[PDB]
Amino acid sequence: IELTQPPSVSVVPGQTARISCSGDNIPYEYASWYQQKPGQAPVLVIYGDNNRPSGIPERFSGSNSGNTATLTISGTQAEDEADYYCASWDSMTVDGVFGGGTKLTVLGQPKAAPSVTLFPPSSEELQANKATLVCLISDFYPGAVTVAWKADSSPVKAGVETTTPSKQSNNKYAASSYLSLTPEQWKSHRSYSCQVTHEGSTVEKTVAP
Amino acid sequence: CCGGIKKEIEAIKKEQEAIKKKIEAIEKELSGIVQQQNNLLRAIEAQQHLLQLTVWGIKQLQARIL
Amino acid sequence: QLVQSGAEVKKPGSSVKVSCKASGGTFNSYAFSWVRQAPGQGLEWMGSIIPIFGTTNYAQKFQGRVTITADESTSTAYMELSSLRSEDTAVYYCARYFDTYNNYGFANWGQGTLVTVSSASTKGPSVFPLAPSGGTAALGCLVKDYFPEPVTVSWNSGALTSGVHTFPAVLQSSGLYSLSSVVTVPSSSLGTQTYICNVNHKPSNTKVDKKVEP
């Protein structure tokens, strides 16, 4: 037995959303749906004959029709943007089986600009032959992020590393950029900027050695 | 008219007070049942659960075979 | 309700147990499954056990490699996968079903257990305090080139919680990770309170504390 979902499904804020689970030797009361937000265990939302666990919002309903499970959200929300899974049991083998998941997207959307911050080197790390600088891009939408570091005044690219953006609980993305370096080059050039562009603006932060 | 109030009030007041406590006893036994009726429900639901649990248990064993 | 063993690192071909303690409730009434998730991938179901008989059944992919057991005395389920290979690196979840009789769904989950199957080498973090000075103010910790995932950061032994943003890890070219964790606070509480940075990297058995102030 195997389950089949649309790999993603996108929707306008406040609409009916429908993920379909399909195949093959049927369930029905065995079928379950789960919502997983990034960095979290799945939370059962629907089970059996259209049943919500406790404290689950009514916008969620379970539909069924022969081969097919369909989770259905009425009037979707930003918080409903998550990855959804269907699951059921093979009646012969009793094996559990999950669908491949479905990224429900409500991409748009109410935009917020990257709040950037920069910590100086750890003074205790200076002691320890090193002095990395810590830049914290966060709270932005979309996940669009592209950064330029800078020493004193001259363009910089090499020597650093950066993280890809990742969705927060607040659905707004985040990032981190560091510059490991020698505990002498930092107390040689003065302040350090951080040119974080979000496809229009460019946000800095500057610390004094 | 009167004279026969002597023979009636002191008669069908006692038997009509032999009701005003032979009912005031039942109202215990009714809820002496709901006491039990509810434990029973509680008991069945416990078995029902063990049953589903054992069915699966059998499906799993049966699956281990053939 | 369900809480699992901590994250591990395993050499290829070796093995690993993972435990899950089911708190408060009758252990004989439970049914449990293990479900693993590879980074950025779907959930995949591995096996089930019914504690009160200890009858298990497993997915064919893992049959031979996986055993699941339970211990009623301690209310614990275990999964153990042997002959480990890279593709087994995953987060492993423990899930309870038959919450009620008609409910074939996984009503309760573990916090997850990250298991990492690389050949060498376990490395400890370099925990650093950060430099601080009704408005805004923010301090934090730095964890430098360690290996592998994950790494834990909590503040004041579990006290300080509100407005705290822990950040994801960069994996370096070196093959080591680093991450970052800061606390947002108003100007009106700086150099008075206490501020501990508690870091746990369980795989290296590293548990560290760290203080911070202007």
Author numbering:
A (entry chain L): 2 to 210
B (entry chain A): 2 to 67
C (entry chain H): 3 to 52, 52A, 53 to 134, 140 to 220
Paper text:
The envelope of HIV-1 and, particularly, its most conserved region, the transmembrane protein gp41 which mediates membrane fusion during viral entry into the host cell, has been for decades a target of extensive efforts involving structural and biophysical research, drug design, and immunogen design. Purification was optimized for the (CCIZN36)3 peptide (called 3-H throughout this paper) that exposes, in a stable manner, the complete N-HR internal trimeric coiled coil of gp41. 3-H is a disulfide-linked trimer that includes three copies of the N-HR helix of gp41. In this study we describe the structures of the complexes of 3-H with Fabs 8066 and 8062 in which one molecule of 3-H was bound to three Fabs, as well as biophysical properties of such complexes.
One of the antibodies, Fab 8066, was broadly neutralizing, while the other, Fab 8062, was non-neutralizing. These two Fabs were structurally almost identical, differing only in four residues located in their CDR H2 (I53L, T56F, T57A, and N58V for 8066 and 8062, respectively). In the case of Fab 8066, a global analysis of the ITC, fluorescence and sedimentation data results in a Kd1 affinity of 4.3 nM (68% confidence interval of 2.0–7.9 nM) with a reasonably good fit. Similarly, in the case of Fab 8066, a single complex at 6.38±0.06 S with a molar mass of 150±7 kDa was observed, consistent with the binding of three antibody molecules (Mcalc = 169,318 Da). Analysis of Fab 8066/3-H complexes by cryo-electron microscopy establishes the presence of complexes with 0, 1, 2 or 3 bound Fab molecules, confirming the results from the sedimentation experiments. The crystal structures of Fabs 8066 and 8062 complexed to 3-H were determined at 2.8 and 3.0 Å resolution, respectively. Comparison of the interactions of the CDR H2 residues in the two complexes reveals contacts between four pairs of residues (F54/L565, T56/I573, T57/Q575, N58/W571), that are unique to the Fab 8066 complex, as opposed to two interacting pairs of residues (F56/I580, Q64/R579) unique to the Fab 8062 complex. CDR L3 interacts with a neighboring antibody only in the Fab 8066 complex. In the complexes with 3-H the rotation angle between the variable domains of Fabs 8062 and 8066 was 5.5°. Our previous modeling efforts which were based on the structures of the complexes of the two Fabs with 5-Helix led to conclusions that the binding of three molecules of Fab 8066 to a N-HR trimer could be accomplished without significant steric clashes, whereas the binding of multiple Fab 8062 molecules seemed more problematic.
